[PDB]
Structure formats: structure tokens, C-alpha cells
Amino acid sequence: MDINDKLSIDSPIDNKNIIEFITFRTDTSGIQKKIKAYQIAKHIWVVPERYYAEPLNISDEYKIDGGIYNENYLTTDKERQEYLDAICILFKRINNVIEGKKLLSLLSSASPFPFKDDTNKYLLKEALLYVNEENFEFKFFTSNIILFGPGTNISKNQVLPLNGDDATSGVGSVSEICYNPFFTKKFGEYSLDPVIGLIECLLKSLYNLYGIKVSDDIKIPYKLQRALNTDKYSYINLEEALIFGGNDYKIFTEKPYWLSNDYFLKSLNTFEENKAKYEKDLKNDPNLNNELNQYLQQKYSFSISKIWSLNLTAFADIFNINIPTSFLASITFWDRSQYYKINYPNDYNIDGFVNGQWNTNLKNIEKDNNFIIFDKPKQIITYINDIFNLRYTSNLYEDNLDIESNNYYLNFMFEYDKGNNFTINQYKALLDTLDNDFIDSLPPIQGMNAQNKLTSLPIISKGTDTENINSELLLPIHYLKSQTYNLDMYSSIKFTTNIYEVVSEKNSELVYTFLPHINEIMENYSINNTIKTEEEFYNWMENLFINYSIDILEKRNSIIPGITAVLPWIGKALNILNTNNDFEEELQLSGIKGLIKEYENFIIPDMIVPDIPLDNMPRTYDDIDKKLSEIYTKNKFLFLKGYYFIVQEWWTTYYIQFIELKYLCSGAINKQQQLLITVLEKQLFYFTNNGLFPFDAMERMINEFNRSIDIFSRISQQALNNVDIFINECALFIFNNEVYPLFLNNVENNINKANDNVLNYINKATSLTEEQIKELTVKYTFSSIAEVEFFNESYFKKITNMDIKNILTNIKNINNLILSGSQINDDITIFDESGNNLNIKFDPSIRIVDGHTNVAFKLDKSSQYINIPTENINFSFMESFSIDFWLKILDSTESTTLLNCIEDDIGWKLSIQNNNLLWEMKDNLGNNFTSLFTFNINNIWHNITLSIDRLTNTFNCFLDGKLINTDNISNIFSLETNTPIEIQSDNGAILLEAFSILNYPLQQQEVLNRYREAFSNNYTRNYYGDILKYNENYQLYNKTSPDKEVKKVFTNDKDYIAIEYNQNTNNPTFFSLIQKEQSKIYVEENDEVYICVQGDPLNYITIDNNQAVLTKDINLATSFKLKTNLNKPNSLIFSENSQALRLSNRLNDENYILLDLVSKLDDEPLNIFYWEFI
């Protein structure tokens, strides 16, 4: 059984599963010391001590950029306990999901080949001999992996295999892991999940256990090296690339493969005979095997093709962690190395970070006594200007991946005999073929001997030191430094647009901004007297948000092909294409290539295989059709490996330069944000430090400014998304018409070549078929240029879209809600259609019934409710929103509630007050605003949409697409509250439908559009607004006499229908529509229908001299074509040809119904021709 989780604490005992062993290699002193470990799981051990082998400290020369190297760490029992607790927490979290516990099951039975002369197994630690008594009791405790603490470098989590020789040959190795979970990086405004750091160590160890390691020699191009004046590539290890999957792993693992480097064949081939030997030698059950058959039967049952599919990014998807899938191994190193301590008991539980990945708010590891973050920035660049004394230094940071030249692309060899392998119908999910329960059920190994061939692994690699290179122009990194503020809190800030001002003094209070509106605001702003009341502080904050929103979100539609729109601020932020010319126009003249350093030594593959052999082989239609088919398809494959080859090269040469711009734009935004929060932050501190405002008022401004931070970050993310799209377009554009056209020209030449090759292959031995070649020709003409083409622009979007997503915040679109619903069985569902704020609650007692053009929720009972949380629904004074829905009041109710979003008498609610809508909303400051719509909702479908525009401070209310109040809301500030939006009647029965809350404040024009779209089905409606139904009886009225009902008159020596006055009986006359054919349930516009008057004989409606007399025969009925007009939507027209029904002038207390030619008034006929059903 899995989820073992000993959960052991301290040192209660040192017996049974708790053992004390001797270290494999020697300590730094040069001696092996005894130590104790704890068994977390079957064959899995932990030891909460720093790595014995690695020194507790090293010289400054040997320190790596972004290490810790603190010696007084994990040198106490409480730290050892903290680490122990940290491990079981992480392993429980691994056991939390199904895939995680499948890996741990595999690890428990992934013992390397236990080869023996009837004695031992593979490498392993020793049991205590009872040397306490100096006894010599020998025993071996099984251990597939051993988890140590951090070694010399705390930041480094490396998996050291105790013998690399057998860890490559396929024998395997029980590797030792030195992993530290307490510190993680950010990469943005979110914290990296420690399980990724530990899962990666487990996967690396699993390769060692299976003996499938790449021997450190097999490397792949990952990315063009980040510098100025280098043009080499930074090569990544294949094993790392397999694990750090992301989008870099999808581009080379498509269905047609690449040079396997023999590894994907060597390892598979080595696996074949390793599987073969077990079944024919070890499965013969030698008596000294000690039940290792089952572990080996399960270990060899799993295919390595499934271990390779285990990438580190799909695991992040399983735990639902956000991770930079673009360049996972490198993108985390492109800035100063900063670590944040994780308090595992508190800040990280079985379900990941407690406070979510963004808002966990950990503390920087910077502390005086211990923990020095040794940072050596590769390529410290200092801008130099001899126009005037100006020297502006900036630090660059790069990954620690080793670098090679452009060889891979130059001397890449396509092996023409690489036909498709594996790729059976079945291979596209994780952990498909293994046993969880069966592996778990197997007892552990507790009795046999163990070998020890400790291959030394002391490959010390003192790294490169920094280079101090000058520069003649202001780099983006220089601009980014200008954006940052590096001073006290108790010191002023000065904004400017002249970058040259800031560079003059390195850490002057002055900071550069590329946002004109923001600079204008800060031109006249003193922390002393500009803001003097709470209300003014809020307003200034609102004013900043507005101006900030306007500057960064600015985009214009582009005339460049392949680009929808262009961000004109990118010029002023990173100093790229930043001339006196407009950025739009500079991009025109300079082109898209102006955004990238063009790589001259770009390699385009040649892809020529004209080899066509000849002979007389007469088998299987002389194997001609087959031979040319397999040749045609191999040429298709060869060209496809070339297209795949050219995509990888474009990725690692040209996209890297684009994702890098994404990184640069990312900061540039955040930076400006940081400035805007800081200028606000200093202002708040100015109040507090000088006393000034009281606690109640102070606490509110603090509370509101804290809230506002994520609101800056909301539109900040929105800016990056505009960048994401803009850059991707540019990235695909470079490939589209600068790499692809050159690659197509090679294929076109090879097409005509291979075409001519097959034409030159006419081995027409003995008698020949002159005609048949031309049939063979069309098959293998190679005319299918498009068929061989695999340029699905979708593919490039799939790899480059949201590749670094939610850097600023996880928060999606806000104030977005549609709230539809569906039925299943007798059961219902209610969800956000837009898929935002999906944590909805409701009782299933609610019935879903047809309404106006939709399905409506029937809130009958008071107990019934719909409860919509406000997790991403902001109602701060800086947030404008609107609410839109359709409502019908089922029963005559004077006073009921509909909506409610109020907590402690703060928030907003909508309710019914004496058949009148009552909208009130009141804020935290005690400013109330209330509005009473007195249009007297009377049991009729109504479109209630009402918009709160926080820009102009206007509250608009539209009913049925028509604006009413348009009051001013200026006196009303933030009414954000935690309580959800509640929808319950409380006093009445209502029908609610199409309940939408919108991110922006609607206007008259757009509201009217929304109202009109609700009629686009062209259904006829009764008076109440409900859609008219066939074979349903109604009362007929002329819309001109609401009070008087159309009533039949029978046995008058003429039977007809007419409106009677002084009725006083109003003998209910019920009419129903019926159609001769295609009998439906819902009555659409423009349908042929007859009118049935309910009566004992059940007579129908016909025409006699244009009168509407009642016949009794239905073949004697008249056909009316129903026409509806939007202006009167609860009204019908019974038109035959170009005459419609009309009411006559009063004659004998009776108004007769007759057909009259329709007379209109600007497309809109008289009120008479319109009829209503009830």
C-alpha cells in the first residue's frame, strides 16, 4: 500500500525501518562517517543532513551566480526536523494525485539489475553491524533513492548517481539526491512550486535507476546565447530536454522523428535483451532471487517510451501549477537571483501553496548573518558616452548551460533509413500501462546481500567569471534600470521622460517613465499638499489608474501583413526602434527584422536524396508501384524532417529573441506599476508617520490601496497580453517570409530533381507498358506541393501562445459573468458561460423553464437562491461595471428582493418596491445612493440593464433598451465587500434569464443592440412576452381595446367574432392557433395558421365579404400569415396577401373584425392591425 508517509519526527528510535548506515563515499575530511536515515516510502530514504561529500563552505572563487553557501545551515536537530516535515509534506503532495503515486510505485520497484554469483544485489548502504557492542551483524536495507540535504550549493538540486558507468550501460544506479525545498525563485510576480524542483530530481533519479542516462555527451541546441557580441548557441543536455518538456519538446517530438543519436534506439535495444534475459534466465526462479522477480517483472513491463513521455511540464498541468513552458531551463535565470524562504508547516500544504502561487507573499532570503546570495552577473555592461561624461552600468544574467558553436545546424545528418518507429495507434496519455495496487501490495526486500562498486564522480567545474564590456548605445537593460527606484522610502520621487536625465546620476530620486499622462500628473505633485483628504487620496489614486490604463494599453491597428495591431510604447520602453520617428512608422521603414539581431550564419537544410536503384525484380507487380510509393513517401518524410529541422532552428535562433522581448516588456510594465504603487505608498506612509488621519480613516486607505495593487496588475497583465500577441505575430512573420521562403526554394529544386529522377527511372525491361508510366507518373509526379506542406499557422500559435502567462497576476477578466444553465435527467446545472468565477452555488429545487428567447430560472420559493461569489468581481470605485438580465414577475407582488451584494450595510442591491424597481448602493464611507424605477413592472418580460460608469461617475439604467435615470454617482466610492451576489425572491416568484455582469459600463447604443438581438429568433409573442404556442387557447384582444375581449356570437343566422360593449359577462372566448402542416410547438413569424374558436362544436375562422365569420368546417378556414413588428413585440398581425386583420367602427355595441389592406406610417402600420393573446 502506498502513501506510506512514516511522518517520523526527531529520533524516537533507531530500529527496524529506522537504520544507521555508513556513508558510501568519504566526507570532506577524507573519511566515511556513520549517519542515520529514515525510510519515507518503500525503498525510498531521506537524511536531513547537508551532503557529506560536498564541503560546508567553499572559497569565493568556486561560488556560482545564485548560490547560498551558508555553512551554519541544517546543522541542528530542529532544522533536521523542519526538513523531515518538508519531505513528507512534498511526498504526500506527490501521492495526492493519481499520476504522482504511479511514479512513486514505479520508483519502489525500479531496482537496478541485481547481478550476483548467488550472493548479493546492486549497490546499497550497510545495516548497523551493532558496532555499538562491536558486533558484526550484517544486513542490507533496500534503497532505490536517497534524499540528502543541500550540499555546498544550497540552490543546486543535483542528482548524483553513485556510478555513472552502469547508469548509462542500462544496468542502472541507485542515485543519491541532494535537494533543498525551503527556497524558491519567482520568475515574475509568482513563486515557483517546490514540487517541480523535487519531481525533476525524482525523474532524473528514475533515468539512473533504469540505466537510461545520456552520458552527458548527447546535447541539443536550446537557445541562442544571451550577450551582445557572441553569436554562439547554448546547448542543453538531451536528458534535461526530455524532462523540462514545455514547448521546446513538442517541436522535435512530432510523428516524424529526427536523428535519434542512436540513444532512442540504443536504450530501447539495450532494454530488449535486458527484458529477454529476465524472462529466460531470472524468471527461471533462482532460489537466491528473494522475490525480486515481481519487481523486475513490473520494472521491465513498463516501456521506456513512456518514461520519456514523462516531462516536467505535464506534471505541472496535473498539479495545476503555472510554469514558464517556453524555455523552462533558461528563462528562470535572466535577472538577479533572489530566493524566498518557504515555511512548510504554514505556507505549503498537500494542495500546494496555501495562499495560491501569486499571493503567497513569502520573505526574501536576504538576511544579515547567514545566507549570502553570491551573484556574479555575466557580462556587466556599462553604457559610455563621450558627448558628455556619462557612464551607466547595468547587470546581465544568463543560464548556466554550456555553450557551443553553430555546428549542430551545419553538420546535421538526416539518416534516410529512419522509418517511423513505435507510433502505434496507442500513445497519447500518462502512466497508461502499470500497476499501482499490485506494486504497492508486493512486500519489500528485507533479506539478501548487496554489492558496492562506488564509481567516483568528483567532476569539479569552477565556472567562468564576469566580463565588463562597454556599450555605445542605451540597451533595453539600461532602460529597465532607469525604470527601477533604488532609494529610501523616506525620500522623494521625480518622474521624467528624458532618459538622459536619469543616467546622469546613478541612484538619483529621478526615474524615467515612458507614460506621458503619468509624467504630466507627477509634474505637479507634492507629497505635502497635493492630497489632503481621504476622498482626494482615493480620487488621485483613481486618476492615476485611469491615466496608467490609457498609456500602456494604447494600441493601433497595423498595416503590416500578419499583424493585427501595434503597441507604440515599446519604442520608448526598451529603446528598440526608438527614433524621433513614430514607433509605428519606424517599424515600417526598419521592418520587423528591426526588432531582432539578424543571424547571418542561418542554416537551411539541403534535403536531396535522388538515389533511385535499378534491376529486374519481378515480385509483387515487379515491386514498382510499392517501390515508388515507399520512395515517394520517404521523400515526403525527408522534406518533413527538414521543415521540422527549420522550425527548431527558428525557435532557438529567432523566437528566443522574441520571448526575450516578452520578458523585457513584462518588466517594463511591472516597473512602471511599481513606481505608481510606490508614489502612492510613500503618500500613505506620509500620513501615518505624521499621525494626521485617524485609525478608521487610515485603515481604509491602506485597505483600499492594497486592493488597488491587483487592479494595477490586472490591466498590467492586459498590457502584456497585447504584447504576447504582437510579439507572436512578429515571431511567426520572421519565419513566414524570411525563413520559410528560403526553405521552400530548396524543396522546389529537390521536387523537380526527384521528379526528374523518377522520370529518369524507367527500367522498362523486356516488353514495356508505354501508357502505364503516365499512370505511375501522376502518383509520383510530386505535384502535391500543398500536400507535403505542413505550415499550419495553428502550430506556431500552439507553441507560442501564453507561453509565459500570468506573470503579473493569475486574475483573469474581471466583472465577467453570463450565468446560463442547463438540465440533465431531473437535475439542473448553473454555471458561468464565460467561465469566470465558476465557484457558483445554488439549490437544485430551482426549475429551468422556457422564457424570452431562452431558458429562465424559476425562483418560486423563498428558500431558493443563486449564490455567485465575488472572488474576481471587483466593485471598487476604480471599477466600472454593468448588470443586464431579463425578468418577469410571475405573481402580483408588491415588495420582494431580487439581487443582493451587501455586507454590513455596504454594497449594492436590487429589489422590488410597490411594483417598482429599487436600486440602492452605498459605500464604506457611508455615502448612500438610491434609485426607484417606477415603470411599474407588471407580470411582463422586461430587459433590466444598469451600468455604473466609474470614469464619468455616472449611473445609467436602461429598461427594454431605453435609458431612464443617468444620475451622477460621484459622491459614492468603493463598495467592495466580500459577500457574494445572492439572487433570491424572498417574497415572490420570478423568472430570471440571461443574467450578465459586464466589465465595462454600457451605453444607450450598445444596450439597444443587446435588446434587439433578443428578438432575432422571430418568435411570435403573447402580451406577457412569452412565445406563442400552437394548440394553446388564449384570449384575443385588439391592442386598442385592452379591456374588451373579442367574443364569438353564434346562431345569429350568421356566426362571427366581435368586440362587445357592456359585456358584464365577458363569456370567456378562447382562441388557439393551428397550422395545417408541420404542426410545431412554438409559433414563429411568417407562418400559415388558422384560428380555432373554442366552443362546444369548436368552430373556426373564415372570410365572408372580408368579414371574419365563424365557419364550423375546417376546410372552410382561412390562412393567415403572422407578421410581427419590433416596435410592438407583444402584438401580432394576421395578414393575407397584403391585407391584415383590422377592427371595424362601433355599430351596435359591437366592433366587427375585417380584413383591410394594410396602411403603414413609416414602415409602421396603425395600432388596429396589431392583436394580442392572453
Numbering used by the authors: 1 to 1174
Anything the authors wrote about it?
In contrast to free BoNT/X, NTNH/X exhibited high thermal stability in the toxin-free state, demonstrated by nanoDSF curves with late unfolding onsets and single, sharp inflection points over a broad pH range with the highest melting temperature of 49.5 °C at pH 6.5. NTNH/X was also stable at high protein concentration (over 40 mg/ml). We determined its structure by X-ray crystallography at the resolution of 3.3 Å. Although the electron density map was not well defined for many side chains, we were able to build the complete main chain, including regions missing in the cryo-EM model. The overall structure of NTNH/X in the free state is very similar to that in the BoNT/X-NTNH/X complex, exhibiting the same domain organization with only a slight difference in the angle between the nLC-nHN portion and the nHC domain. The structures of the individual subdomains of NTNH/X only differ between the free and toxin-bound states locally, in certain loop regions involved either in the toxin-NTNH interface or in crystal contacts. The high stability, relative rigidity, and domain arrangement of NTNH/X support its function as a structural scaffold for BoNT/X. However, NTNH/X has an extended loop with exposed hydrophobic residues, structurally close to the NTNHA nLoop. This loop (NTNH/X residues 128–138) could not be built in the cryo-EM model of the complex, but was built in the X-ray model of free NTNH/X where it extends into the solvent. Although not conserved in other orfX-type NTNH proteins, its position suggests a potential interaction site with other proteins.
All BoNTs are naturally co-expressed with a protective partner protein (NTNH) with which they form a 300 kDa complex, to resist acidic and proteolytic attack from the digestive tract. We have previously identified a new botulinum neurotoxin serotype, BoNT/X, that has unique and therapeutically attractive properties. We present the cryo-EM structure of the BoNT/X-NTNH/X complex and the crystal structure of the isolated NTNH protein. BoNTs are 150 kDa proteins and consist of three domains: the 50 kDa catalytically active light chain (LC) and the 100 kDa heavy chain that is further divided into the translocation domain (HN) and the receptor-binding domain (HC).
